[PDB]
Design a protein around this ligand. Structure first.
Ligand SMILES: C[C@@H]1O[C@@H](O)[C@@H](O)[C@H](O)[C@@H]1O
Ligand SMILES: C[C@@H]1O[C@@H](O)[C@@H](O)[C@H](O)[C@@H]1O
Ligand SMILES: C[C@@H]1O[C@@H](O)[C@@H](O)[C@H](O)[C@@H]1O
Ligand SMILES: C[C@@H]1O[C@@H](O)[C@@H](O)[C@H](O)[C@@H]1O
Ligand SMILES: C[C@@H]1O[C@@H](O)[C@@H](O)[C@H](O)[C@@H]1O
Ligand SMILES: C[C@@H]1O[C@@H](O)[C@@H](O)[C@H](O)[C@@H]1O
Ligand SMILES: C[C@@H]1O[C@@H](O)[C@@H](O)[C@H](O)[C@@H]1O
Ligand SMILES: C[C@@H]1O[C@@H](O)[C@@H](O)[C@H](O)[C@@H]1O
Ligand SMILES: C[C@@H]1O[C@@H](O)[C@@H](O)[C@H](O)[C@@H]1O
Ligand SMILES: C[C@@H]1O[C@@H](O)[C@@H](O)[C@H](O)[C@@H]1O
Ligand SMILES: C[C@@H]1O[C@@H](O)[C@@H](O)[C@H](O)[C@@H]1O
Ligand SMILES: C[C@@H]1O[C@@H](O)[C@@H](O)[C@H](O)[C@@H]1O
Lengths: 354, 354, 354, 354
């Protein structure tokens, strides 16, 4: 792989509804977003079946739950602008049409919830800088003007809240290194400058918070293995050294914090099957990768059910969506084998960043 | 103190709105619930001023945020039944009138959110058993019938979600020991029998979840000191031994999990000032109690702001509400001194359980 | 129990030889010290049988391994002075006679090894102060003069090295509180003043080091339950709050750090059987006490074998020594039932401090 | 670097005496072992000056403290056999002549102390297998016959005790991977088969025990960065995945467990200066490498003083020994700059394994 490669992404975006039912969003062969959902937040739930949103789109969709429980989806349109739609009531299948947010965008959109309940969206813009736009009142359709955060991006952005409520954004730069930028006061328009975390990454960055409030970042490296880095925490502005984990991976990674407070990462492996690794104790070392049966055609997208069971979605070789999950809440739970969520096929609509 | 004492309670119930603004609920000299709130989730926010809900009540009010962001308050009425009111839209001061849930209740109400978005309320009933009633659809005014969980209670109930989504309820029994009962499957009407955690407690029990998903319970003991116990976790049905902490306390305790993932407890001390103790490292031993200046006339009620700053409310010697808070997000932050939230005086409306 | 009670002590002192074989020292009905030992450091080792040291003694004996591997025993004599004897070669049954160290002593002796290889002995003296005497060259019979550390003691002293090589000594004071005093530079004659850790204790204090270098102290409290306190560590001069553990105990406690780095404490319980409690995770909460079958007539004395198996010695109702042990090295090992180390009976020679 | 490279080794072997004074052993331009030592275990100690052992040698020397405190040194002779010498009394400069242990050896010797006080030495033999010989009685000159443990080695062996007293040996195999072999019962002649830990390493392996009893292994990898792996512990036979740490290193690493229970590693860096990294919390992530001033000409050899201060020895550009150290016991201590231990120059006598 080249230093400038971006590993194969997830084929859906997933959210929990207000009632915690899982719901997935992908793009079909008609270049439209479709969605499907659990009918009940139970281990044996049926799924509703695929439902279409009319309108042609030109990126992967990003979904987030508002602070009033309503799901809202962001996508690039045929005009290269940002568009969004939403549930008009939490847990209900009454959606708005696609509505315009304008701008000129050149990445998939990334959405985060501020600590004061306002959604905020981050994209690469026409000048390759990071741009952003936000709700100006929590869970309301009153949006700011577009504003630039500068930089030169070569991946999609990834955003996460610090434990103190400050949004921090990670993105690969022109030197193929991981860069980041952050709010310097919680949920305020006061941002740092861009700083480098060095290294080279060959996927979009993925970020998660540990129990103790430290952000941890995962990405594929130049040698095609998973690597990770973390905030050293307490008063400090610093981060750890980077570490690689052995095992060649062939997609973006997806990270989750299990019921027990420990980190787990999923990725397509060198043999094109799903691999999983977990921290074996607190902060701990990481397990050898474990494989699930079956060749997969996207990165995993990982979610947690209402009862904390982990569930993983992928593109199959039939170009449909498949999933598997933990059968019980224990971190030692058994797993199911891949099952089909049939009715449509999906395409990878991700923006070709080059 | 007698084994059957119940330490002085908090004078308000507090919640975060959908936008994370703090809002408090107490009962004034007119025996009505009044509320007040931060106008913005900022460290220097003004407060709106006290607003009254018409109607005479006969318990402490309990508030919880619905899964759609709307606050909802529960209280006993003049008819000894349960009543409730709610924001009709998240973050807005448009409330319903008090509406009936019926029943016959003999404690303050305790409200919990299931892991599937449905509110559930626990009370002592006319027969001294634990009773419960719940939303049958998330964030909707469709409520179940009343149902009994048996037992014989001598404190108010305290409810908390396990990390796997099962509600567990703690209450003092007829032998003055801590008892508990739990959902055996997440957000389902399938409950355990009552089991004893032994000991004797002389306050309502207070419960919190640690980072690693273990519940921990705090209460005042027979010797008037704080004591605590925790789930041993992983696969186990067991709990730890009890431990006491030195230092005589003179109110119910209030527990909070700080930004760093560590536990802190607040309580009125032997000298009638606010005391605080914290875990000095992970799981760790506990700090000696630290005091804040000023005599206080209730237990503390503790909350966290949108940026993780801890804030504490108490009844003053003037019978008004006072508060203090961390000036910044660090666990080493300085604290303010008590400041008045003036405009009304409060009474302790707690149900006299004897 | 009275605040000034001192719980029943262990009936033997135990050490590991240079080869790690266990060896025990007690006083028989002839008021002489006798000893016995494992013939091999193996789980099924035979014991040599009881061997007598000629000479009448008037305290419990204290043993320590020199920095050259030779065991050395300290005891009060018929003249109320300190006496000592030693192996003349490591792992060999060629002992010196009792030889004089003089002084006037009014407690059992306590021996510690400095971090520079010199033995040091702490006693209560004729004026009730703490006194000490030491080897002036490692593992040599060149001893200092006696020197006073002041104070007013009401228990035997207990000494332990800090992780940085400074000896620290714990003893109950005239107010029945735990006091302590320490070297302010490693293995140097530069000591702090006495400081109080407050509380009241009703046993000799017992001290151990945790993995992370923090000392932890265990003692029975005024309410006859185990209590404990620890250094908060890093740069700090401070200690934690005290915690009690439920369960009435009826002897001194004995603490051990298992193979896994976790603390375990043993004590005679309220029913006069051996009880055990362990930290269930790192720093963690403590397990409920677990009992072994059989009424015992002393506190436990606890040791670890060459392979880390824990072994516990007690006085039986026949007035002989009994022991039990872990059958394998795991912290989940099964335990044997009490077995007799027959051939003599023992008396409790502890100095009656009142 | 090639997969079969073995990074530059330490220029001395170091031990603590019975009194904890540091003492170093190297080979000079006369192909003889010389040694030097602290005269007192103090932060400002003078060093005695270089003293020669007569006799020409043909490997790096290995030293270990016996269970009776006497230092003992192992080296290959001009006849390719193993030879050894020892202090005839702990802490004294009265040494034996070199005495024969015979055999045919083709690596540097590695010495370990069993948990029953017997020294054991591991070498590569004439057939490239691992061979061993041991004291048959603790701290005695009664040695076993030579015995083979098989395998095919391409590095020097590294031995360490498990927490349960079982010796485990690590060595690079014919495939350049890390292999290991272990006692299956403590201090017994009952060994496992060889098993692979996979990976490729380009230095001798270095092993240390964590607080919690898990062995951790450090080595340079194929990409010239530090990598490490650990036992997953409790009941398990398994190890973690390998992790690399960023930063190109140019010598063997040296690992130490500080006062606080945390791991630190030292290595010559890409700029030929001494680099250091530490675990920033428990098990934690690792700090970015920190550099000390000055170009160095060997790997570091790391030791701890009687008071826990870390001290590091290296070969200078003048071909003499230099050292630096922590000025106080805190893990935040300042460090000195390199100072000369003058009087001789040293050569790297390591056996050329190819
Ligand atoms: C998502 C939107 O879909 C339709 O609504 C188009 O008219 C827009 O340009 C956009 O593609
Ligand atoms: C998202 C942003 O869209 C508009 O406001 C442009 O002027 C910017 O360059 C950026 O493309
Ligand atoms: C991910 C799925 O894996 C197996 O179940 C295959 O049979 C499917 O086509 C799909 O690739
Ligand atoms: C809270 C309610 O307040 C009024 O609405 C009364 O009519 C009810 O009995 C109840 O007290
Ligand atoms: C809350 C409950 O109220 C009614 O349904 C009563 O019949 C019960 O006894 C209990 O008091
Ligand atoms: C809690 C407050 O503490 C001090 O500030 C007093 O002056 C007030 O009356 C009040 O008791
Ligand atoms: C331990 C010693 O035993 C004998 O050697 C006596 O003569 C001494 O006074 C002392 O009791
Ligand atoms: C151990 C000490 O013995 C002597 O040196 C006495 O003068 C002291 O009072 C103390 O008793
Ligand atoms: C400690 C031992 O416990 C039981 O085994 C009794 O039969 C013995 O007499 C002794 O008390
Ligand atoms: C270390 C030994 O040194 C001398 O004693 C030689 O005679 C031996 O062959 C060996 O080299
Ligand atoms: C150390 C060993 O030395 C002898 O006993 C040889 O026969 C072996 O091959 C090995 O070299
Ligand atoms: C390790 C030492 O580093 C510097 O102090 C140089 O001046 C020396 O020659 C030596 O290389």
């Amino acid at each position: 792989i080249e230093n400038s490669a971006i590993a194969l992404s997830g084929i859906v975006s997933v959210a929990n509804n207000a009632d915690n039912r899982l719901e997935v969003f992908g793009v079909s062969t008609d270049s439209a977003v479709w969605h499907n959902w659990q009918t009940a937040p139970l281990p044996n739930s049926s799924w509703a079946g695929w439902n279409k949103f009319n309108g042609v789109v030109t990126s992967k969709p990003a979904v987030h739950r508002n602070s009033d429980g309503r799901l809202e989806v962001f996508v690039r349109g045929t005009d290269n602008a940002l568009w969004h739609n939403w549930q008009t009531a939490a847990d209900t299948n009454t959606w708005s049409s696609w509505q315009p947010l304008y701008g000129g965008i050149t990445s998939n959109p990334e959405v985060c919830l501020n600590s004061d309940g306002r959604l905020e969206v981050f994209v690469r813009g026409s000048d390759n800088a990071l741009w952003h736009i936000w709700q100006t009142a929590a869970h309301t359709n009153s949006w700011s003007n577009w504003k630039s955060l500068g930089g030169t991006l070569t991946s999609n952005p990834a955003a996460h809240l610090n434990a103190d409520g400050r949004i921090e954004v990670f993105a690969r730069g022109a030197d193929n290194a991981l860069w980041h930028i952050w709010q310097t006061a919680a949920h305020t328009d006061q941002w740092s400058n861009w700083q480098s975390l060095k290294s080279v990454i060959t996927s979009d960055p993925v970020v998660i918070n540990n129990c103790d409030g430290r952000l941890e970042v995962f990405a594929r490296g130049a040698d095609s293995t998973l690597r990770h880095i973390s905030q050293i925490g307490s008063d400090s502005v610093s981060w750890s050294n980077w570490q690689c984990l052995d095992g060649v991976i062939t997609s973006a990674p997806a990270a989750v914090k299990n019921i027990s407070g420990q980190l787990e990462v999923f990725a397509r492996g060198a043999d094109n099957t799903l691999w999983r690794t977990w921290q074996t104790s607190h902060n701990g070392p990481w397990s050898n990768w474990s494989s699930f049966t079956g060749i997969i055609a996207s990165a995993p997208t990982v979610a947690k059910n209402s009862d904390g069971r982990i569930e993983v979605f992928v593109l199959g070789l039939d170009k449909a969506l498949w999933h598997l999950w933990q059968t019980t809440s224990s971190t030692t739970s058994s797993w199911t084998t891949w099952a089909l969520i049939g009715g449509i096929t999906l395409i990878d609509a991700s923006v070709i960043l080059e």
